[PDB]
Amino acid sequence: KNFVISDPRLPDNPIIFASDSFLELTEYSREEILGRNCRFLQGPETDQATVQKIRDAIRDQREITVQLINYTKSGKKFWNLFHLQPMRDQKGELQYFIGVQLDGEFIPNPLLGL
Ligand SMILES: Cc1cc2nc3c(=O)[nH]c(=O)nc-3n(C[C@H](O)[C@H](O)[C@H](O)COP(=O)(O)O)c2cc1C
């Protein structure tokens, strides 16, 4: 499983954990991504309209699934089916965000443009 956990109580909602698979996919070592917002995976061909939907889902604390282009450390592109989910503690208070990444062009690109 490719996934990261971020802490929205810390400035700029930084990564506090990244799985081994996520590091292999993105070509980053854990030390150079901890404490950073996961936006470093976006690049020139990333649809900003899709990024806007992630921004709203984090604001409203809703789960969302989108497909978008991301970049590995060396600049290699990959399609990312991205599922974001809020994690709440026993008191029903927002505690973490978990983002799961599935690499592949699952939804055909010409259908996604609609
Ligand atoms: C847990 C978590 C995982 C995320 N994973 C990705 C990702 O894999 N790819 C991506 O493009 N954005 C991902 N994001 C979204 C960015 O981190 C960021 O929230 C988005 O770009 C909007 O924020 P910004 O406008 O300040 O950059 C993730 C966000 C969270 C909270």
Author numbering: 389 to 502
Please give sentences taken from the publication describing this entry.
Phototropins are higher plant blue-light photoreceptors which regulate the response to excessive- or low-light levels, leading to, for instance, phototropism or chloro­plast movement, through two distinct light, oxygen or voltage-sensing (LOV) domains, LOV1 and LOV2. LOV domains, which belong to the larger Per–Arnt–Sim (PAS) family of small-molecule binding receptors, non-covalently bind the blue-light absorbing chromophore flavin mononucleotide (FMN). Under blue-light illumination, a covalent bond is formed between FMN and a nearby cysteine residue within microseconds, constituting a photoadduct. The formation of the photoadduct is associated with structural changes in the LOV1 and LOV2 domains, most notably the unfolding of the C-terminal helix of LOV2, Jα, which leads to the activation of a serine/threonine kinase domain.
Unexpectedly, we observed that, after a time corresponding to twice the relaxation time constant, the space group of the crystals changed from P43212 to P212121, suggesting that the in crystallo relaxation of the photoadduct population leads to a phase transition. In addition to this expected result, we observed an unanticipated phase transition, which occurs 70 to 80 s after the release of the PS equilibrium. This phase transition consists of the loss of a crystal symmetry element, which corresponds to the transition of the asymmetric unit from a monomer in the tetragonal space group P43212 to a dimer in the orthorhombic space group P212121. The non-crystallographic dimer is obtained from a crystallographic dimer whose molecules have slid apart. After the phase transition, the continuation of the ordering of the C-termini develops asymmetrically into distinct conformations and at different rates. While monomer A continues to fold in the α-helical conformation, which is completed within 130 s, monomer B refolds at a slower rate into a very different, hook-shaped conformation, which appears to be fully completed only after 1620 s. The difference in C-terminus conformation is coupled to the orientation of the side chain of a nearby bulky residue, W467, which rotates by ∼90° in order to accommodate the hook-shaped conformation of the C-terminus. Most importantly, we observe that residue W467, which belongs to a well conserved FWN sequence of residues found in LOV domains, acts as a gate discriminating between the two conformations of the C-terminus. The loss of this salt bridge may drive the sliding motion associated with the phase transition. In brief, we observed the appearance of a symmetry-breaking phenomenon during the in crystallo relaxation of the LOV2 photoadduct.
